[PDB]
Design a protein around this ligand. Structure first.
Ligand SMILES: [Mg+2]
Length: 366
């Protein structure tokens, strides 16, 4: 987070959660939130998605304690489970601000005490929040930020009407709260909300090829932690009905990685020690969406008819840089920018520099 508008204290708290970086798509959300802009972001459930809004909002508030104070931030989540995770993430990176979590199927007593004592960041489900507005205990007239998290799930559950009622209280045109909308897909209801509640100058973060062509990222990671980071990149960059190829050197690396719990459910391997008939079947299956993650060695990948994919991952810097560039060309479906990730170890640091010289390319070192 060097030259990121985050305090040293916050960076130390993030380290305590094993957060040492934000993926570029998350890093882009940070700047839009930090700059005060209204936003529609496209990302699914993840650790870094919550931090994309939590870190810049917390920094803002820390810069800006009366008993019974009204919240400054409202985060609506569709379930008790999701609300509890968002609240915990805020609470883990701020020891200064009062963080509260309000959901249904629970008594009012504890929630009443939080409101009596004062709240800075309020996380909750629409039903319970609406109830507290109605009973006159919750003040949403002093909000500065509103986050509508997992709008897809929220709408699927039938909350659209209740969310519209809640927003109608906080957005009574000038000096309205900063509005942040998050989802994995962008339904009709998302832009209908933006058209009414959001400023005409609202931003969008979704990976559609906006004069970039192809992203080349570099991740410094010890081999023992690579599988957890690989799952995280797929969750962040690839989506539902997503195509991802992971390239390895050794057949054991590809086999073990495909068998590894991080992606075991969605992954399938392709190496020399697999019969040709099965290698044929498996590639055909990948093409016709039987599974979403193909873990193949760089050897078996030579000459193999690979389709257009969302994300290309390298376990270590590529020795055949020529093949790496060809695969970059065959990345980025449905008008979206292609993501090319290269994992490297401290010992493989110069090995990644060779790729850059040989290809005449610059990796976003994250
Ligand atoms: Mg076919």
């Amino acid at each position: 987070f060097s030259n990121f508008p985050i305090s040293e204290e916050t960076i130390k708290l993030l380290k305590g959660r094993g957060v040492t970086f934000l993926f570029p798509i998350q890093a882009k959300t940070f700047h839009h939130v930090y700059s005060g802009k209204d936003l529609i972001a496209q990302a699914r459930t993840g650790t870094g998605k919550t931090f994309s809004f939590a870190i810049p909002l917390i920094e803002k508030l820390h810069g800006e304690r009366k008993r019974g104070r009204a919240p400054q931030v409202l985060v609506l989540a569709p379930t008790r489970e999701l609300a509890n995770q968002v609240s915990k993430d805020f609470s883990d990176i701020t020891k200064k601000l009062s963080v509260a979590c309000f959901y249904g199927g629970t008594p009012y007593g504890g929630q009443f005490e939080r409101m009596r004592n004062g709240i800075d960041i309020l996380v909750g489900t629409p039903g319970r929040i609406k109830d507290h507005i109605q009973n006159g205990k919750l003040d949403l007239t002093k909000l500065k930020h509103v986050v509508l998290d997992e709008v897809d799930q929220m709408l699927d559950m039938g909350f659209a009407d209740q969310v519209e009622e809640i927003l109608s209280v906080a957005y009574k045109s000038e000096d309205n709260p900063q509005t942040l909308l998050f989802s994995a897909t962008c339904p009709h209801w998302v832009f209908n909300v933006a058209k009414k509640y959001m400023k005409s100058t609202y931003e969008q973060v979704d990976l559609i090829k906006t004069a970039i062509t192809v992203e080349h990222l570099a991740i410094k990671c010890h081999w023992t932690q690579r599988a957890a980071v690989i799952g995280d990149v797929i969750r962040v960059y690839s989506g539902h009905q997503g195509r991802t190829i992971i390239f390895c050197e050794t057949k054991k690396e590809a086999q073990e990685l495909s068998q590894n719990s991080a992606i075991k459910q969605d992954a399938q391997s392709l190496h020399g020690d697999i019969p040709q008939k099965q290698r044929e079947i498996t590639l055909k299956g990948f093409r016709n969406g039987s599974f979403g993650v193909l873990v193949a060695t760089n050897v078996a990948a030579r000459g193999l008819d690979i389709p257009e994919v969302d994300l290309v991952i390298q376990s270590s810097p590529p020795k055949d840089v020529e093949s790496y560039i060809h695969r970059s060309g065959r990345t980025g479906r449905a008008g979206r920018t292609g993501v090319c990730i290269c994992f490297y170890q401290h010992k493989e640091e110069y090995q990644l520099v060779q790729v850059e010289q040989k290809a005449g390319i610059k990796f976003k070192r994250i």
